[PDB]
Amino acid sequence: APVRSLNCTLRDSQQKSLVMSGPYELKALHLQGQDMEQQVVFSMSFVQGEESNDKIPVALGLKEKNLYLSCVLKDDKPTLQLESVDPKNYPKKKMEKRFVFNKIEINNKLEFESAQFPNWYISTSQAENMPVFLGGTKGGQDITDFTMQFVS
Ligand SMILES: NC(=O)c1ccc(NC(=O)[C@@H]2CCCO2)cc1
Numbered sequence: 001a002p003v004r005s006l007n008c009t010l011r012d013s014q015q016k017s018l019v020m021s022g023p024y025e026l027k028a029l030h031l032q033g034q035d036m037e038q039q040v041v042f043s044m045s046f047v048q049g050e051e052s053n054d055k056i057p058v059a060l061g062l063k064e065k066n067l068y069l070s071c072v073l074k075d076d077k078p079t080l081q082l083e084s085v086d087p088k089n090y091p092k093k094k095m096e097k098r099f100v101f102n103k104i105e106i107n108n109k110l111e112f113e114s115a116q117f118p119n120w121y122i123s124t125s126q127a128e129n130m131p132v133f134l135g136g137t138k139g140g141q142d143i144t145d146f147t148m149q150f151v152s
Contacts, residue, residue, distance in 0.1 A: 003093040008151055013146065016028040026069075027131055028128075043060075044060060045061065047100055048094045049100050057101070058100070059091060066086070067082050071098050
């Protein structure tokens with residue numbers, strides 16, 4: 001059958017919202033009121049992959065855009081990028097591994113681990129208006145926990 005998808009927003013555990021501000025540039029900042037329209041709406045697809053009660057493989061596309069978060073090596077490091085795809089062919093149930101995140105539920109928060117790069121996570125900085133990135137530890141000063149808001 002098709003792939004199943006939900007519209008949603010994400011906020012980091014310091015309640016920073018995610019926005020587009022540059023061509024392929026997703027950023028995290030404190031947002032409230034009128035400016036909350038600026039936040040990115042995701043289409044979260046439930047994709048093929050290894051699954052358990054609290055670890056669910058997803059892809060994160062931008063709503064009604066042929067753009068997906070992906071994990072690739074850049075200048076020899078696991079990095080987060082926005083990648084364009086053929087809009088005729090996406091989303092699909094069997095997403096390529098660079099597109100797959102394990103959505104992990106721990107203590108009423110979510111983490112998004114790269115399926116491609118184990119123990120690398122979607123991360124934000126504590127500072128305002130810095131890139132969303134792939135961080136190689138769910139420890140330290142960087143933020144690896146999120147909440148999801150379901151959107152119409
Ligand atoms: N110097 C640049 O032209 C440039 C800098 C940063 C970005 N993107 C990111 O850092 C991505 C955004 C999705 C996750 O991380 C894109 C372009």
